Scaffold this active site. Structure first.
Site, PDB file in Angstrom:
ATOM      1  N   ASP A 270       0.831  -1.194   0.000  1.00 35.64           N
ATOM      2  CA  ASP A 270       0.000   0.000   0.000  1.00 35.64           C
ATOM      3  C   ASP A 270       0.870   1.250   0.000  1.00 35.64           C
ATOM      4  O   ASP A 270       2.091   1.167   0.003  1.00 35.64           O
ATOM      5  CB  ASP A 270      -0.959  -0.002   1.190  1.00 35.64           C
ATOM      6  CG  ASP A 270      -0.258   0.163   2.509  1.00 35.64           C
ATOM      7  OD1 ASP A 270       0.925  -0.201   2.604  1.00 35.64           O
ATOM      8  OD2 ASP A 270      -0.898   0.653   3.459  1.00 35.64           O
ATOM      9  N   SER A 271       0.231   2.412  -0.015  1.00 38.06           N
ATOM     10  CA  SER A 271       0.947   3.656  -0.198  1.00 38.06           C
ATOM     11  C   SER A 271       1.736   4.062   1.044  1.00 38.06           C
ATOM     12  O   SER A 271       2.705   4.844   0.917  1.00 38.06           O
ATOM     13  CB  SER A 271      -0.038   4.750  -0.586  1.00 38.06           C
ATOM     14  OG  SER A 271      -0.878   4.964   0.503  1.00 38.06           O
TER      15      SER A 271
END
Ligand code: PC1
Ligand code: 3PE
Ligand code: 3PE
Ligand code: 3PE
Ligand code: 3PE
Ligand code: 3PE
Ligand code: 3PE
Ligand code: CHD
Ligand code: MYR
Lengths: 122, 171, 173, 128, 156, 86, 459, 275, 63
Positions: F41-42
């Site tokens: 994920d970011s």
């Protein structure tokens, strides 16, 4: 140290004033007091070119030390015994100044003790 | 404009960097870096964007309260001790045009190569200008993005000062 | 060189060496190296130069200025007499500046020479410096950048009047 | 519930602490897009000159010319004598002059009075 | 080149002058705000935020990186005061008023304590230092002709 | 400060990622998209960029950092800033 | 003085009769030869001035100003010949003629024995100066600058003419030697108050005095480079030279009439020094710097002490070389970027290394680094002003802090930082430009070795 | 001069306690030492002030060169938070840094002892401002704390610098330049102290507690500093106080004066004087 | 290399300086002024042969 607490946080009337001491006569309680001897003459200290603050009652030991230092060059670890005699002479001069302070303090105590005793009479 | 997601990720990187400045020791920093990540993961899934905004504003207030007054800065980053240290050595390439012929004769190979680059720039310029004219709306460009070269033998429009810029350690 | 009466200095008293150490004195051996390597070749070159100067000996003279009547004897607006008096006054003024400089140079040489005993042993030089500065201040202080003999005279008469007034009211008492 | 940030002239509000930054309506988005368009248009005008291989000289900037013109030539035409300008000019113009006149006139009158009475020490004062 | 229509003018009175001024300065009509029309001579020059150039993004590709300015944008009236060598207005981790109170308080406290320490000096319990020959009357430059008052020191 | 090379940059970039517990070293290549391939994920990507800054000792601005989605893009970004051409 | 007047006059036929392509070589060579012979004026005596004839004389005050004047002519020809290269031949020759005629009027101005001869030549310098500003200045503002220059000078100098003629009727002579012996004290009356103002305002405007200085930032900024060099280096010093002469006949009234002008100068120097910190035009900054320095000369002349008069003479010479150098340095950038804005071209040390050394040396002399003659003059004035009133050291001290700030701000803004990306025509410095700078700074630093020759008659 | 020096030595030593740039710590150390020299002026001991100038030159110069050696080896890193674990990696810079710190703190018989300890003794026994005396002693203790701060973070612990290790202090130019100053930092105080002529009367009679004040507060400083530094390795969070921020931001003097004074002066120049 | 340096940068400068001081500076009054040497009791003056008397007997302190 301790003496500062007494003057500042206590009775300042029975504590010496360092900027105004001595306030009693030199002979008050001292029968036949001798004057301090000075070994080095004014011309000797002038010729030696001592700093004025060094022209005190220990100057003769200082002169002896300075002459040794010059004559022992380049051995800068010599004259260690000459240096100590001057240091010890200055130490005794400092103790004499400590005795003057203690003498001044005890006379101030004595002066007060007389006032209260000489006041309890009234 | 920064999206909400960009604002959160910038905060996360800022918070970690100031955390590292406080912790110093690596094992201590690893521990608290993982606690801080856990806080961000706690609200990772928050569909309500009004509440996700409120969480963001409070986190920034908490950061400002907790920021290190003297954080670590990479030496060459803005505010670092070496930032701009080498700008005095960066000389633009156009200065070489003013060299005396006796100075150019000391590098015959470099200057022959340089003439090929200048010839390349001259021959590309008209097509770069034309490509920008035809790809730009009537009002004018609305962002600063530049396009690539669409053809073979074309160069991306406005390349010279990017490609020929001084080296970071020019001397 | 210079006159020893104008720029006096007392006789030099150097203590003799009296070592109490077996170690050699580095300065003594550096002093002999200096004489051989520095003072000796420098002395030879100077002697060569002084021989050339002795072949061509010529003279220059200290200019003497005859005394001319001063401003007090000049009649008002008489520029030819005022001119010669004013030029003489300016020459004397420059001379008096140099006299003060000589007395200052004596004072500074004394303070350095006497070391830590200067406060006592330079009393004579200090006294002479004080007297000359007072006399110089009386003559020339406060005249302004446009000073002249006329303004100097006006200043003297103002002072003489004050000294004459302070006396009649100091002899009345 | 952390203590609030209190901005001053010489210390601005941090961007992340500014309430406006977090409520972004469509009209605000549109304004930002319009600002970027102006910047982009100016950037393109500059680049077409800056990257031109045949140009040798200075790219004149009208914004720089406007700034120097506004800071000099344009000031007097837009000046109006009124209460604000008249008072400030009098206070900043004449004020200091009157003040320093009375400082030096007072000091010199005192010093002059002492010299006439021989009460000022000028024992070694022969340079002036 | 620059024509008179591209140069600063008088304070814009109408909304049509305000739009013309905003276009001249390359600004949105909503962002354009002149200085108040007092008699101080700003004319129609835009009143921009009073922020130091130090406050601008260092990572953006400025046309003038050192000034952090782009070609063609309106320059702050006081730009030469807000260059990175001069006045900084960046946010500070401590509030401005709190910084002022702590700096002033520290200095005022130290000045007060120094005044106290001068009134109640520390010293050692010793009488005065003693010097021979009438407290060195002649060494200190005493008049050799005048006879000084004797200063006699005693043993103890 | 010895000079960097393209292979040297790539070796160290991949080296750091193989010490990250969320990445499988056997499924990691230079073209592995951090989100589409490695499934991160970011927030993970922010931590990856931070490690690269620590690895090479300089900062990558957030505006540029957010676009570095595979190892090869990190290598190219570092190579461009360091004037590495071999 | 005919051994200098006649050779100066011959520069004109030399210029007009020269081959078309040798006008600059010929006039420069022979103007340097005249400058060389001016060193014969250094035959000064301790008591008497060097009195040539009924018309002319030279003392230690006028001699250094004469040498500076004659030195400046070749420097101005060097500074001008680049930007006049496309001018047609006849107009070039007329430009040189104006410079020669200005030199002729100046050397006669500084040696005139009679104050009315001094006056005529003192006004005469206006005509060539006005023509140079308005004809060969570059901007539209040169026309307005010429009018401010002309009418500020004449507003003051016409009352001076009435005063001088009044003095001749009362004393019988305006010969300066005669006035030294026939001078009478000035009684304190209203009529003498306006005589004092008439005798001083013309010189005050030329200094310029703070308040009366608005012409200078216009004239010094709009003039061509040769115009700025002579305007700042020499023409401002006509006011100082005139005041130093005429104060002879104004005592003791100067004691109290000085106060308003001392306040204007002491406060004015701080005001104009502050202005320099926020100037956007490099030439304008250098012009305001001159006003601040000349405020010290005004104060020094008005307090009338031997130390202040030596300091004033040194400052006038020191400022002349420094301000001329700064204008030439600023002009060399202008000839490349064609703008006077200071923030336009930055980081020039990277592109022009040696020229950045001249900037540094020019800046250091401007902020009066010891032992430069700039510092010697400023120091002597500060010493004398401390005796006038101790409190003045505050204003003098603040000014020296501000002067350092704007001197190095100019250096840092233009020479340091990063170069401007789009300015790509900064070609290497020409031999002419480098020689022009070194002919300013080399004499300036050499004078530090023998300062007495620029300390004036009070030395 | 006594009070001016006393506030300087205390204020700049306090700033040094929280700085992370190695050159800032040494710079604030210099300001603090200069303050102590100004105190020596204020107690009428000019020759002791001069001696401290001479001795300070040796070990202070060496400390900057040692920091330069570290900065160079870590590719221009000046933050001590990114150093660590250099005790064995750079043995010679480590030796010089420890000798330099011990000389600065007045370890007996090193170069700094022969001036700093006479100064403290003279101040303690003088007729002097009481507050100035206390500020000086506290500043002496803070000297030990920030000296410990450099050693603890630069040399001890585990490395905190980047992974490509280019540590190399084997250039003869580096070794011989530091080596000569190291010899000066050990013996110069002793040699100069034993060769200069006496120009005052040194005070050698005082109570035991005034004779060991300099050494005792230095030891207390080392102890307290070593407890603060070990605390930084405990997995416990940070709560910054007002005192920490005051020290870190240099008493806010630069932040206020370097913004307020330029703003007021530059605004007046344009608004009033110019326009 | 060191000998060429010693000759050009030490020996020649000291020759020029020594010639300058001996024949130009010291030939003018008060240009070089020495603090006069310290004289101690028991010393002998080289110029005169005078012998400075010793100090008087010390009241030997305990040490
Ligand atoms: C013409 C230009 C302006 C100056 C000319 C002379 C002064 C005219 C203006 C004042 C007129 C009233 C005089 C009042 C008075 O008693 O005298 C002044 C009184 C003192 O005068 P006083 O009464 O002692 O008399 C002076 C001595 N006698 C008469 C022998 C000459 O107060 C002052 O000292 C103030 C001086 C006023 C000027 C201040 C600076 C210049 C201001 C004008 C600027 C113009 C632009
Ligand atoms: C001494 C003079 C002191 C002046 C006191 C102030 C006078 C005043 O305030 O009058 C106001 C008047 C106009 O007022 P009004 O039109 O109602 O404006 C209202 C909008 N604010 O103002 C006017 O319209 C008349 C203009 C008055 C002119 C004032 C003159 C003083 C200005 C300062 C001069 C500076 C001198 C320079 C000093 C040398 C150094 C710089
Ligand atoms: C004096 C007489 C007054 C007039 C002359 C002095 C002028 C003072 C005003 C300065 C004018 C502005 C000049 C340009 C300087 C400037 O603007 O630069 C600002 C500069 C920024 O410095 P910095 O904080 O380090 O920011 C770096 C960013 N990373 O910051 C600076 O460098 C400027 C700092 C100047 C602050 C001066 C404060 C004076 C304090 C004196 C008090 C002590 C008094 C004497 C000693 C006490 C008694 C013993
Ligand atoms: C004793 C001490 C002296 C020191 C103090 C000196 C103070 C400064 C004196 C300044 C004199 C006035 C200002 C001179 C600057 C130049 C004037 C100027 O340029 O103004 C321009 C103005 C605009 O009009 P214009 O230029 O004609 O339009 C373009 C067509 N050419 O042009 C005009 O509108 C016409 C301008 C006419 C004024 C010309 C100057 C004459 C000055 C003398 C005034 C005469 C007063 C006589 C009155 C007696 C009766 C009361
Ligand atoms: C604008 C247009 C107006 C122009 C100004 C109008 C003239 C102003 C009048 C000033 C008064 C001067 C005066 O009239 O003095 C007359 C006086 C006559 O006396 P007299 O018989 O000659 O000798 C014995 C002394 N009673 O004569 C004298 O004794 C001395 C006269 C000396 C010559 C003075 C020349 C006139 C000076 C006027 C300007 C001076 C001020 C300059 C500006 C001041 C600053 C703003
Ligand atoms: C901005 C425009 C620029 C142009 C500026 C033009 C300046 C022109 C100035 C002209 C003023 C000349 C003075 C005329 C007044 C009459 C003088 C006089 O005769 O008064 C005598 C008296 C002397 O006093 P006293 O020293 O006590 O006597 C000897 C005993 N000791 O008088 C005295 O008490 C001596 C003091 C006189 C000076 C007063 C100073 C006033 C305060 C300073 C103002 C500074 C200038 C202000 C300019 C603003 C203009 C708008
Ligand atoms: C690496 C090279 C240095 C290694 C040195 C090893 C240690 C040498 C110590 C010698 C020693 O132990 O004797 C100490 C001696 C003093 O004599 P001491 O024995 O203590 O007296 C008691 C009677 N038994 O001490 C002495 O003799 C004098 C001091 C000896 C140490 C100094 C060595 C010379 C260094 C000179 C450096 C000077 C640098 C400064 C230059 C500027 C000077 C103005
Ligand atoms: C003495 C020193 C050797 C240092 C070393 O080898 O470690 C050498 C190195 C370079 C030399 C200097 C430089 O070569 C420049 C000079 C040129 C002349 O040939 C001799 C003097 C001259 C001024 C030099 C003499 C000196 O001996 C130097 C200084
Ligand atoms: C009597 O004259 C005493 C003089 C001064 C006493 C100093 C003793 C030290 C106590 C305070 C030191 C605190 C440092 C952290």
């Amino acid at each position: 140290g301790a003496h500062l607490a007494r003057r500042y946080l206590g009775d300042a009337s029975v504590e010496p004033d360092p900027l105004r001491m001595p306030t009693f006569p030199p002979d008050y309680g001292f029968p036949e007091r001798k004057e301090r001897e000075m070994v080095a003459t004014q011309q000797e200290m002038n010729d030696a070119q001592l700093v004025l603050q060094q022209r005190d009652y220990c100057a003769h030991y200082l002169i002896r030390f300075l002459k040794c230092k010059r004559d022992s060059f380049p051995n800068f670890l010599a004259c260690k015994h000459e240096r100590h005699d001057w240091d010890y002479c200055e130490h005794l001069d400092y103790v004499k100044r400590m005795k003057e302070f203690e003498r001044e303090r005890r006379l101030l105590q004595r002066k007060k003790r007389r006032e209260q005793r000489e006041a309890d009479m009234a | 404009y920064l999206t909400h997601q960009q604002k959160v990720l910038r905060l996360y990187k800022r918070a970690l960097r100031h955390l590292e400045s406080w912790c110093i020791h690596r094992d201590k920093y690893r521990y608290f870096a993982c606690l801080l990540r856990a806080r961000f993961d706690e609200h990772k899934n928050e569909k309500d964007m009004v509440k996700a905004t409120q969480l963001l504003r409070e986190a920034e207030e908490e950061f400002w309260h907790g920021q290190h007054p003297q954080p670590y800065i990479f030496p060459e980053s803005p505010g670092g001790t070496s930032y701009e240290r080498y700008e005095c050595y960066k000389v633009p390439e156009w200065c070489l045009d003013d060299w005396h012929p006796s100075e150019k004769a000391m590098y015959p190979d470099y200057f022959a190569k340089r003439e090929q680059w200048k010839k390349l720039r001259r021959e590309s310029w008209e097509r770069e200008v034309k490509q920008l004219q035809e790809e730009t709306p009537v009002g004018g460009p609305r962002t600063e993005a530049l396009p690539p070269a669409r053809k073979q033998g074309d160069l991306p429009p406005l390349w010279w000062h990017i490609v020929t810029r001084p080296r970071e350690r020019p001397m | 060189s210079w006159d020893k009466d104008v720029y006096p200095e007392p006789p030099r008293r150097t203590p003799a060496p009296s070592p109490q150490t077996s170690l050699p004195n580095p300065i003594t051996y550096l002093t002999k190296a200096f004489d051989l390597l520095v003072d000796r070749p420098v002395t030879l070159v100077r002697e060569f130069i002084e021989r050339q100067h002795a072949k061509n000996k010529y003279y220059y003279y200290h200019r003497e200025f005859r005394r001319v009547p001063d401003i007090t004897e000049c009649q008002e607006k008489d520029v030819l007499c005022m001119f010669e008096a004013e030029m003489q006054w300016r020459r004397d003024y420059k001379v008096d500046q140099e006299i003060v400089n000589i007395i200052q140079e004596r004072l500074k040489a004394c303070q350095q020479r006497e070391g830590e005993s200067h406060r006592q042993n330079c009393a004579k030089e200090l006294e002479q410096f004080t007297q000359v500065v007072k006399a110089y201040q009386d003559r020339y202080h406060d005249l302004g950048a446009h000073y002249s003999a006329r303004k100097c005279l006006a200043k003297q008469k103002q002072r003489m009047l004050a000294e004459r007034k302070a006396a009649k009211e100091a002899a009345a008492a | 519930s952390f203590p609030k940030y209190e901005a001053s002239r010489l210390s601005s509000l941090p961007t992340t602490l500014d309430p406006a930054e977090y409520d972004i309506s469509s009209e605000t988005r549109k304004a930002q897009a319009e600002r970027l368009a102006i910047r982009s248009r100016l950037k393109r005008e500059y680049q077409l000159q800056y990257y031109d291989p045949s140009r040798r000289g200075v790219i004149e900037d009208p914004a720089l010319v406007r700034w120097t013109y506004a800071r000099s030539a344009n000031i007097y035409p837009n000046f109006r004598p009124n209460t604000k300008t008249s008072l400030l000019g009098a206070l900043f113009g004449i004020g200091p002059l009157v003040f320093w006149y009375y400082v030096f006139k007072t000091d010199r009158d005192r010093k002059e009075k002492l010299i006439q009475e021989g009460k000022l020490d000028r024992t070694f004062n022969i340079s002036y | 080149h620059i024509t008179k229509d591209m140069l600063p003018g008088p304070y814009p009175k109408t909304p049509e002058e305000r739009a013309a001024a905003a276009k001249k300065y390359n600004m949105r009509v909503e962002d354009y705000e002149p200085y108040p029309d007092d008699g101080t001579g700003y004319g129609d020059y835009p009143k921009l935020p009073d922020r130091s150039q130090q406050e601008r993004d260092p990572w953006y590709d400025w046309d003038h990186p050192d000034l952090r300015l782009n070609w063609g944008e309106p320059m702050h009236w006081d730009l030469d005061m807000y260059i990175r060598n001069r006045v900084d207005t960046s946010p500070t981790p401590v509030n401005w008023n709190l910084m002022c109170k702590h700096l002033f308080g520290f200095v005022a406290f130290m000045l007060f304590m120094f005044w106290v320490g001068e009134t109640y000096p520390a010293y050692q319990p010793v009488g005065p230092k003693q010097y021979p020959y009438n407290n060195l009357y002649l060494e200190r430059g005493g008049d050799p002709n005048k006879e000084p008052e004797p200063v006699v020191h005693y043993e103890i | 400060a010895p000079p960097l090379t393209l292979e040297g940059i790539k070796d160290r970039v991949l080296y750091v990622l193989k010490l990250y517990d969320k990445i499988d070293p056997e499924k990691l290549s230079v073209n592995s998209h951090f989100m589409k391939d490695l499934g991160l994920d970011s927030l993970d990507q922010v931590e990856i960029i931070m490690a690269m800054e620590d690895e090479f000792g300089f900062e990558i601005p957030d505006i540029d950092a957010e676009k570095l989605m595979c190892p090869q893009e990190i290598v190219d970004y570092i190579a461009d800033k360091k004037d590495v051409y071999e | 003085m005919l051994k200098y007047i006649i050779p100066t006059i011959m520069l004109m036929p030399l210029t007009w009769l020269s081959k078309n392509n040798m006008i600059w070589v010929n006039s420069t060579a022979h103007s340097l030869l005249i400058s060389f012979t001016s060193l014969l004026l250094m035959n000064q005596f301790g008591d008497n001035s060097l009195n040539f004839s009924l018309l002319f004389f030279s003392d230690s005050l006028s001699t250094p100003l004469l040498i500076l004047t004659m030195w400046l002519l070749p420097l101005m020809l060097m500074a001008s010949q680049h930007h006049l290269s496309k001018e047609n031949l006849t107009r070039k020759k007329l430009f040189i003629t104006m410079l020669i005629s200005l030199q002729l009027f100046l050397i006669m101005t500084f040696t005139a024995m009679e104050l009315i001869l001094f006056y005529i030549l003192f006004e005469a310098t206006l005509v060539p100066t006005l023509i140079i500003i308005t004809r060969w200045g570059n901007q539209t503002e040169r026309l307005n600058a010429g009018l401010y220059f002309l009418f500020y000078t004449l507003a003051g100098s016409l009352p001076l003419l009435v005063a001088l003629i009044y003095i001749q009727n009362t004393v019988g002579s305006l010969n300066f030697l005669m006035l030294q012996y026939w001078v009478q004290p000035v009684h304190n009356s209203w009529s003498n108050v306006f005589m004092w103002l008439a005798c001083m305002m013309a010189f005050m405007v030329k200094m310029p005095l703070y308040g009366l200085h608005l012409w200078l930032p216009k004239a010094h900024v709009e003039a061509p480079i040769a115009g700025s060099m002579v305007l700042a280096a020499v023409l401002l010093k006509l006011g100082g030279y005139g005041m130093l002469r005429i104060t002879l006949i104004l005592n003791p009234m100067t004691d109290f009439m000085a106060y308003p002008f001392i306040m204007l100068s002491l406060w004015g120097m701080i005001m104009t020094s502050s202005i320099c910190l926020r100037q956007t035009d490099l030439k304008s900054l250098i012009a305001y710097s001159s006003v601040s320095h000349m405020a010290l000369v005004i104060v020094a002349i008005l307090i009338q002490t031997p130390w202040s008069y030596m300091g004033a003479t040194a400052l006038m010479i020191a400022h002349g070389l420094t301000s001329s150098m700064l204008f030439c340095l600023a002009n060399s950038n202008y000839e490349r970027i064609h703008s006077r804005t200071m923030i336009l071209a930055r980081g020039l040390q990277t592109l022009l290394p040696l020229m950045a050394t001249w900037w540094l040396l020019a800046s250091l002399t401007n902020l009066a680094l010891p032992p430069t003659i700039n510092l010697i003059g400023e120091l002597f004035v500060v010493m004398s002003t401390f005796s006038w009133s101790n409190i003045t050291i505050i204003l003098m001290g603040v000014n020296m802090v501000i002067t350092a700030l704007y001197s190095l701000y100019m250096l840092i803004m233009t020479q340091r930082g990063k170069y401007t990306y789009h300015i790509n025509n900064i070609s290497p410095s020409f031999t002419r430009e480098n020689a022009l700078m070194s002919l300013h700074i080399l004499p300036l630093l050499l004078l530090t070795l023998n300062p007495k020759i620029i300390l004036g008659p009070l030395y | 001069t006594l009070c001016l020096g006393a506030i300087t030595t205390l204020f700049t030593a306090m700033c040094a306690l929280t700085q992370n740039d190695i050159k800032k710590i040494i710079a604030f150390s210099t300001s603090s030492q200069l303050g102590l020299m100004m105190v020596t002026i204020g107690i009428n001991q000019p020759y002791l002030a001069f001696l401290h100038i001479c001795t300070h030159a040796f070990f202070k110069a060496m400390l900057f060169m040692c920091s330069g050696s570290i900065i160079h080896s870590l590719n221009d890193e000046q933050d001590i938070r990114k150093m660590g674990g250099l005790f064995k990696a750079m043995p010679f810079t480590t030796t010089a840094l420890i000798v330099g710190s011990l000389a600065l703190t007045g370890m007996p018989f090193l170069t700094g002892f022969y001036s700093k300890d006479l100064i403290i003794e003279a101040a303690n026994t003088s007729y002097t401002n009481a507050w100035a005396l206390l500020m000086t002693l506290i500043a002496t203790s803070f000297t030990a704390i920030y000296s410990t701060r450099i050693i603890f973070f630069a040399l001890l612990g585990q490395p905190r610098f980047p992974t490509l290790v280019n540590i190399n202090e084997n250039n003869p130019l580096l070794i011989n330049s530091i080596k000569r100053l190291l010899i000066g930092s050990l013996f110069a105080g002793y040699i100069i102290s034993n060769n200069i002529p006496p120009t005052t009367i040194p005070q050698m009679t005082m109570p035991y507690y005034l004779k060991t004040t300099a050494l005792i507060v230095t030891i207390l400083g080392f102890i307290l500093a070593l407890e603060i530094s070990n605390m930084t390795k405990n997995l416990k969070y940070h709560y910054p106080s007002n005192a920490f921020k005051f020290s870190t931001l240099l008493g806010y003097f630069p932040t206020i004066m370097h913004r307020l004074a330029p703003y007021m002066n530059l605004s007046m120049s344009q608004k009033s004087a110019s326009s | 290399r060191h000998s060429i340096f010693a000759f050009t940068h030490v020996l020649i400068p000291v020759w020029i300086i020594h010639y300058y001081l001996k024949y130009h500076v010291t030939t003018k009054p008060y240009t070089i002024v020495e603090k006069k040497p310290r004289i101690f009791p028991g010393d002998t003056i080289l110029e005169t042969g005078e012998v400075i008397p010793p100090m008087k007997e010390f009241p030997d302190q305990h040490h």
